[PDB]
Design a protein around this ligand. Sequence first.
Ligand SMILES: Cc1cc2nc3c(=O)[nH]c(=O)nc-3n(C[C@H](O)[C@H](O)[C@H](O)COP(=O)(O)OP(=O)(O)OC[C@H]3O[C@@H](n4cnc5c(N)ncnc54)[C@H](O)[C@@H]3O)c2cc1C
Ligand SMILES: Cc1cc2nc3c(=O)[nH]c(=O)nc-3n(C[C@H](O)[C@H](O)[C@H](O)COP(=O)(O)OP(=O)(O)OC[C@H]3O[C@@H](n4cnc5c(N)ncnc54)[C@H](O)[C@@H]3O)c2cc1C
Ligand SMILES: COc1cnc(OC)n2nc(NS(=O)(=O)c3c(OCC(F)F)cccc3C(F)(F)F)nc12
Ligand SMILES: COc1cnc(OC)n2nc(NS(=O)(=O)c3c(OCC(F)F)cccc3C(F)(F)F)nc12
Ligand SMILES: Cc1ncc(C[n+]2c([C@@](C)(O)OO)sc(CCOP(=O)(O)OP(=O)(O)O)c2C)c(N)n1
Ligand SMILES: C/C(NCc1cnc(C)nc1N)=C(/S)CCOP(=O)([O-])OP(=O)([O-])O
Ligand SMILES: [Mg+2]
Ligand SMILES: [Mg+2]
Lengths: 596, 591
Amino acid sequence: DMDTSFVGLTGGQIFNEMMSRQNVDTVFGYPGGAILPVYDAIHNSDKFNFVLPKHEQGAGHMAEGYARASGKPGVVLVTSGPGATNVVTPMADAFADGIPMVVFTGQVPTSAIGTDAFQEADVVGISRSCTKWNVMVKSVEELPLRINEAFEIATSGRPGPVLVDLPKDVTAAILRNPIPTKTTLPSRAQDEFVMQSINKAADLINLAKKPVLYVGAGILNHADGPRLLKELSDRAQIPVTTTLQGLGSFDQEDPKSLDMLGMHGCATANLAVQNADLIIAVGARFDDRVTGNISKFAPEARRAAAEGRGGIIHFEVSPKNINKVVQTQIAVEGDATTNLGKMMSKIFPVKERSEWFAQINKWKKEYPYAYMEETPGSKIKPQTVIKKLSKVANDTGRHVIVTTGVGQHQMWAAQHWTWRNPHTFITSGGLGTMGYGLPAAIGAQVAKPESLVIDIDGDASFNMTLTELSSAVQAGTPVKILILNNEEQGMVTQWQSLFYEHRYSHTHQLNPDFIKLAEAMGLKGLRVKKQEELDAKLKEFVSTKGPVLLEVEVDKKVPVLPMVAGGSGLDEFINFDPEVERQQTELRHKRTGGKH
Amino acid sequence: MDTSFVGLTGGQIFNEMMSRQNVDTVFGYPGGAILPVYDAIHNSDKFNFVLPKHEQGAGHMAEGYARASGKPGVVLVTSGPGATNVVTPMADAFADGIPMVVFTGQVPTSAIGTDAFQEADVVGISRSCTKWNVMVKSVEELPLRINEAFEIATSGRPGPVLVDLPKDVTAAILRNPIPTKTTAQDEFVMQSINKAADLINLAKKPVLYVGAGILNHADGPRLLKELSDRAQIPVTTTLQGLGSFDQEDPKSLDMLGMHGCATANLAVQNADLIIAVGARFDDRVTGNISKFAPEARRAAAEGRGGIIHFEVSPKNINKVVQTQIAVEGDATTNLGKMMSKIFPVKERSEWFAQINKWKKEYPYAYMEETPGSKIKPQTVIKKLSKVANDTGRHVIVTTGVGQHQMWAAQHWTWRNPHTFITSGGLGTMGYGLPAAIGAQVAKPESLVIDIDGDASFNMTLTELSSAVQAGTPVKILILNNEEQGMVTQWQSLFYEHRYSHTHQLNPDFIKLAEAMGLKGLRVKKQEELDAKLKEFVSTKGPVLLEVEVDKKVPVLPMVAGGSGLDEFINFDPEVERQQTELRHKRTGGKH
Ligand SMILES: Cc1cc2nc3c(=O)[nH]c(=O)nc-3n(C[C@H](O)[C@H](O)[C@H](O)COP(=O)(O)OP(=O)(O)OC[C@H]3O[C@@H](n4cnc5c(N)ncnc54)[C@H](O)[C@@H]3O)c2cc1C
Ligand SMILES: Cc1cc2nc3c(=O)[nH]c(=O)nc-3n(C[C@H](O)[C@H](O)[C@H](O)COP(=O)(O)OP(=O)(O)OC[C@H]3O[C@@H](n4cnc5c(N)ncnc54)[C@H](O)[C@@H]3O)c2cc1C
Ligand SMILES: COc1cnc(OC)n2nc(NS(=O)(=O)c3c(OCC(F)F)cccc3C(F)(F)F)nc12
Ligand SMILES: COc1cnc(OC)n2nc(NS(=O)(=O)c3c(OCC(F)F)cccc3C(F)(F)F)nc12
Ligand SMILES: Cc1ncc(C[n+]2c([C@@](C)(O)OO)sc(CCOP(=O)(O)OP(=O)(O)O)c2C)c(N)n1
Ligand SMILES: C/C(NCc1cnc(C)nc1N)=C(/S)CCOP(=O)([O-])OP(=O)([O-])O
Ligand SMILES: [Mg+2]
Ligand SMILES: [Mg+2]
């Protein structure tokens, strides 16, 4: 069966048509020679909104933030050569964090490919290891097919980035042949096997006496995910901890909430996991930033497994991540949410778990997120800023979205914010890309025009992509940019303090005047130094109509705690100790000859 | 066998190896995976360290450094996003043949292949944009790999290499001694030299087609000048060859190609012999390849001329155009060997008469200022060229990518080697500022000027604060036409003035400069331009000058479409006015 409707159109014009057929409402991009035939076709197009950054990396991270906030794939449209190489970091970032993204790169004409042409890059080769799939379109005839395959692959299984390489002669060419209609249009034994494993997992859960739900980003890839998670938690009385990327999937005000686990997770979550007889892993991949020393990980679960009375259940959509890190007793293949729904009726309702929750509540009382609080004459504490802003933003009654950079401010945002809503924490976790914060916020704001979007950023992170401030003005995105300025690459100085005897090698970048910068870029700029002005400034920050930057001068050389590092198990975290911090301050002064 | 490194960590070995390689500057940004190296180079007296805001900045700085100094640029970044952020500079250095050694931290070997935190397949990603790369797998082979890297980056055609450094390798202590070392065809060439000298002595209308290759040797420009003087041969250069020949010399043809001087293009098309020296016949130079140099091909068919190619990389020989004589190896070296076999020529009356008539007929014409009109971008280049030269200082110029780049290339008078540093092959916007910073580090006493575009500058403007921290008093000139000029030109020409997303919203560049810690200057009026240009150059410390220039001004001449070099579009004042009215009509008076 053939389709003749695209006959007579250029490749560019076909691209434009395929965007509305693929339900694309937003395109992030930057023009150039190779991709000019497509840009002429989308000129003044009302199929979608176009967002123009200052740098293609910005386009990439914007599309990511857009994808995370909307649940739709982020679409990028850039030129060949430097245009394409400039989106390599965002693709690798989306690949690590499972973000659906379709990247369209212009390419030199097919006759010039492989001749080391002007602005030619081997983009398909470069991006092979950091995309789910990529392809070079070699004729206009196969353009709709490739577009359809790209979007499907990007949004199925574990979502991820795909790249489509678009030769200039292909997008300029007129389609002069009918093409298969199928290319233009966007097992019983397996089901029985999945159900079998679902039955097995239900049996294990009904047996557990100290279960823990270990929840990650996977639960958020379905609209009903958080809802079914809660239903399972309430039905079987199971406490819930989340990874960094699962934050927002569970109401942290709920008594059964364990908060975040891992390297910088809540001690209670870490201890609960270390003492659980059953770990129910839902959409999480057991990264070492979560597990700590893997040989020390979940000893009570391993003991339960050896005695046939527990262990680890894994709801995982990708075969690649099953039995990858941890020996699992039961793997439940496919969409976590879907499989939770199927399992629910098989779970015995539990009245209470007195002993287990008594232990957990005692851990909660003993190990809060403690830190050195403000004293007279001291600088503002970064942890205090997060706690205050969390309440201020939440009290607005608006839907709040938070993006971050990478480092200490990121962890403190994760810890001290109170998470309650799905798809409201957007942070770079796997690749951990500095500079993510501002463009991701712009993207998220585009996805959710009514939401209050806050970028909680670091000074070093913000410097990476700060040129996109003007892009926010041009895009009409009233993002709220918060800079926790400690005048350092804090996460690195933390590691240098701990393991390199306070040798701070090249970890202090010279910052610009962030307030003058913001105003030069066309935003309102605010600064706070004094403890007494923090409250009022935070309120003015959140209340501002347009885009606004607020720089908070915060204290320096403050470690993120708790911390699981070295060969420590999850239950061998370093805890906050006020006397230790004081001793570290003296030691630091002496070792740095008074410089820090 | 050598024991001098026994007891040192991999990072400490790296520190010593930089000294042994004669490295005086490292560009980089720290992170988890590369931490053991940064600890070892902490307060190192063996080299200076330059810290950017972005790894792309580090990369382009290293490029600018390499191009001004003649030494390889050294980059030191962390794993994952640190490494992926230097892909564009590597592709840039690969395209332009710039010596660069990139050191990327990597996750511990025990975590490689497990999709670990901040893990990327950097060896895989960078394969197509490096001459060579490697992952160091033990501390014992670290000196060997460092030595290989520097050797490969600086030999043949120079280019980028990458060395992946697993954290556990750089933290590991060398326990065992390592081999001290790790710490016929010339006749075929001589025959070619003889044959090429025979062709040259026979040529009646020869042209020296000179590129970046002649600048990869200290004595390149000198031997080029000698050959040109000896045989009375006119010299044209590529964009990347600018500075290798004195453009004030009567035999200068200026730049050839897509936006080259018409005289240069016409000489090439009418030459009976083309002597290609360190140039790779890119289509930005040749135009339509089937129309390129018809008289040279004709001479070749009659055995009285053709094309001679002095090229160091065999794969670039007969890659684009069929050549009669190939001389493999370093161009400068082979020019020296050839010199004694070239008959001296007193004069070429007819050939230079024809050339000098073209020069009079086809200068770099453009619509000049009129009372009330905006400042013309071409005029700024001419005036700045004189003002900068009048300082008596050594001047180095970097640019961004676009119209300003071409106008810089055209209207500047190039006389000194390694003084024009621009992204040619990859054509990376945002190149100008970080390249200028790196060049200033290489040549602290030089006057370094970034002639940048507004769109290009926006790409990497965050490095302005890095200029302050590095102590590099760069001079930043922004030709502000409030547009992606080179793209709007192509849209005006080929897409009926449909300007699709080619107008980015600029920040206040002066307030930006001041926020970054620089002095900011702005010119709007013609009357202020001269004074502002002089203040700009005479300013001590880093300074930005924004010039509001006229918009929608095409770079001419232009060879595009299926045109041959002699089929260029030339400037015409009446055509420009007609284009202005047509553009107004089609954009509803918006442009
Ligand atoms: C400075 C820093 C510190 C960090 N410290 C911590 C920390 O203390 N604690 C922490 O948790 N993280 C931390 N990380 C982040 C960490 O590196 C990982 O990014 C994070 O642990 C991964 O979370 P995740 O497994 O839930 O999400 P992902 O990496 O996205 O993995 C999701 C898993 O679920 C699967 N999946 C996806 N969709 C579905 C579906 N529909 N159905 C079923 N399965 C699905 C995926 O295939 C994948 O296996 C830190 C990062 C940084 C930069
Ligand atoms: C907007 C724009 C417009 C442009 N328009 C033009 C234009 O009009 N004219 C123009 O010329 N360029 C133009 N370019 C630049 C063009 O794309 C190429 O960068 C340039 O033409 C290549 O110059 P090159 O061959 O001299 O140097 P390279 O690309 O570096 O090639 C040098 C050649 O010499 C060889 N070589 C290197 N070292 C040695 C040695 N020691 N001995 C012998 N051989 C050696 C190399 O292997 C290579 O083959 C433009 C770029 C842009 C962004
Ligand atoms: C704004 O668009 C351009 C600006 N400058 C340019 O060259 C310096 N080009 N060149 C093109 N197109 S191109 O000329 O067809 C071409 C190209 O030309 C081959 C063809 F002429 F044989 C070769 C490689 C790349 C490109 C590219 F990416 F730019 F499309 N578009 C522009
Ligand atoms: C400033 O340094 C760090 C900041 N934050 C970190 O984790 C969130 N890490 N982690 C490390 N080193 S690491 O822990 O040995 C490690 C790593 O751990 C392996 C080991 F724990 F088994 C795995 C992959 C990458 C890294 C890397 F690159 F960061 F070094 N350094 C930092
Ligand atoms: C990373 C990157 N992205 C896009 C690019 C595609 N290009 C260009 C080109 C010629 O390479 O077209 O292929 S030039 C250009 C815009 C130039 O704006 P300007 O700086 O203001 O200078 P002007 O004086 O106005 O001309 C773009 C968008 C590029 N090279 N790099
Ligand atoms: C350099 C670095 N890590 C390595 C690194 C390097 N380069 C990039 C692109 N990304 C990362 N993550 C960090 S965490 C910097 C943190 O500084 P910050 O922005 O100001 O945050 P904070 O100070 O609060 O920890
Ligand atoms: Mg900081
Ligand atoms: Mg411009």
